[PDB]
């Protein structure tokens, strides 16, 4: 009756990923015995001085537990004089649901428009870290300062450059898996603008009644990514009169 066991090593919290079991390890000294209690029941290594012990916990054990309360294991060590108890280690079922609640939709937009891409990722445990892809490459709001990630996992293109014409994809990840949304095509068009009217051609008669022409062109700018053609006359022709 001198001491009480000290845990050199304690069972650590852990996740069931798919149907793969979890090992818990614990080691203490000094100890005449050491053993796992899960949810108040003793459990031996079978289908479940310094001394150590290990166990496995299985998907089935965690599912079949009565109650909403997290499954837990702790170790108990024995000396000549008493017991010590390890921390409680929590084993949780990890998952990432298959379907996105909300995926982004394709858009046409004018140059300099604000674009909002909606994404509501599948639910996960652990909770799902959301990214966005621009033509594969991962966007990053720090560097790419024309982009904001909303706390709702949405993407904002602040004002649309023309290089922002791309395929955009919401990705959700955790330790279980990664899931890609439906890829949304964003297209940034420029509508056409007229040049200035060229100068009137000289009056076909230097003194008397004649005619002259002028023109302009859908080039200021030319339409782009299927923006609108210019609207109105490209060409004019009227009578003129110079006097002598």
Ligand X SMILES: *[C@H]1O[C@H](CO)[C@@H](O)[C@H](O)[C@@H]1O
Ligand Y SMILES: *[C@@H]1O[C@H](CO[C@@H]2O[C@@H](C)[C@@H](O)[C@@H](O)[C@@H]2O)[C@@H](O[C@@H]2O[C@H](CO)[C@@H](O)[C@H](O)[C@H]2NC(C)=O)[C@H](O)[C@H]1NC(C)=O
Per CB under 6 A, residues contacting ligand Y are: 135-136, 165-167, 185
- Told to check if 146 binds Cl ion by CB under 5 A, we report yes
Report the partner that residue 232 touches, choosing among ligand X, ligand Y, Cl ion, none (CB closer than 5 to 8 A by kind). Answer: ligand X
* Pick 51 or 120: Cβ nearer Cl ion: 51
Q: How many residues bind Cl ion (CB under 5 A)?
A: 29
For residue 119, the minimal CB distance to Cl ion (Å) is: 8
Which residue among 194, 201, 205, 212 contacts ligand X (CB under 6 A)?
A: 194
Residue nearest ligand Y, Cβ-based: 167
60 phi and psi, to 5 degrees? -65, -45
- Told to check if 161 binds Cl ion by CB under 5 A, we report yes
Whole-number Å distance between alpha carbons of 58 and 16: 7
Whole-number Å distance between alpha carbons of 23 and 39: 16
CB 81 within 8 A of CB 3: yes
Whole-number Å distance between alpha carbons of 134 and 161: 14
Report the partner that residue 82 touches, choosing among Cl ion, ligand Y, ligand X, none (CB closer than 5 to 8 A by kind). Answer: none
Which residue among 46, 145, 196, 238 contacts ligand X (CB under 6 A)?
A: 196
∠ CA 106-108-114 to the nearest 5 degrees?
Answer: 95
- Told to check if 197 binds ligand X by CB under 6 A, we report yes
189 phi and psi, to 5 degrees? -90, 155
For residue 150, the minimal CB distance to Cl ion (Å) is: 12
Strand 6-9 versus strand 22-29 pairing type: antiparallel
Whole-number Å distance between alpha carbons of 42 and 34: 11
Report the partner that residue 166 touches, choosing among Cl ion, ligand X, ligand Y, none (CB closer than 5 to 8 A by kind). Answer: ligand Y
Nearest residue to 168 (alpha-carbon basis) of 160, 150, 159, 180: 180
| Interface of this chain with ligand X, residues 219 to 238, rule: CB under 6 A | 230-232
For residue 88, the minimal CB distance to ligand Y (Å) is: 47
* Pick 75 or 216: Cβ nearer Cl ion: 75
For residue 214, the minimal CB distance to ligand X (Å) is: 8
Whole-number Å distance between alpha carbons of 209 and 175: 86
For residue 202, the minimal CB distance to ligand Y (Å) is: 48
């Amino acid at each position: 009756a001198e001491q009480l066991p000290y845990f050199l090593l304690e069972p650590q919290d852990a996740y069931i990923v798919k149907n793969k079991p979890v090992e818990l390890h614990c080691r203490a000294f000094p100890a005449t015995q050491i053993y796992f209690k899960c949810n108040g029941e003793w459990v031996s290594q079978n289908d479940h001085r310094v001394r150590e012990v290990q166990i496995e916990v299985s998907r089935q054990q965690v599912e079949e537990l009565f109650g909403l309360e997290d499954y837990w294991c702790q170790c108990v060590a024995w000396s000549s004089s008493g017991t010590t108890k390890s921390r409680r280690a929590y084993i949780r079922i990890a998952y990432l649901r298959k379907n996105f609640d909300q995926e982004p939709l394709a858009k046409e937009v004018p140059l300099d428009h604000e674009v909002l891409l909606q994404c509501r990722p599948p639910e996960g445990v652990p909770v799902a870290e959301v990214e966005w892809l621009k033509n594969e490459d991962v966007i990053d709001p720090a560097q790419d300062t024309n982009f904001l990630l909303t706390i709702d996992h949405n993407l904002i293109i602040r004002q649309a450059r023309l290089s922002d014409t791309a395929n955009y994809t919401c990705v959700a990840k955790n330790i279980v898996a990664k899931r890609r949304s439906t890829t949304a095509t964003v297209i940034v068009y420029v509508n056409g603008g007229w040049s200035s009217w060229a100068e009137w051609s000289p009056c076909s008669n230097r003194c008397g009644r004649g005619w002259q022409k002028r023109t302009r062109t859908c080039t200021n700018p030319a339409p782009l990514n299927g923006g609108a053609f210019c609207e109105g006359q490209a060409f004019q022709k009227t009578a003129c009169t110079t006097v002598c």
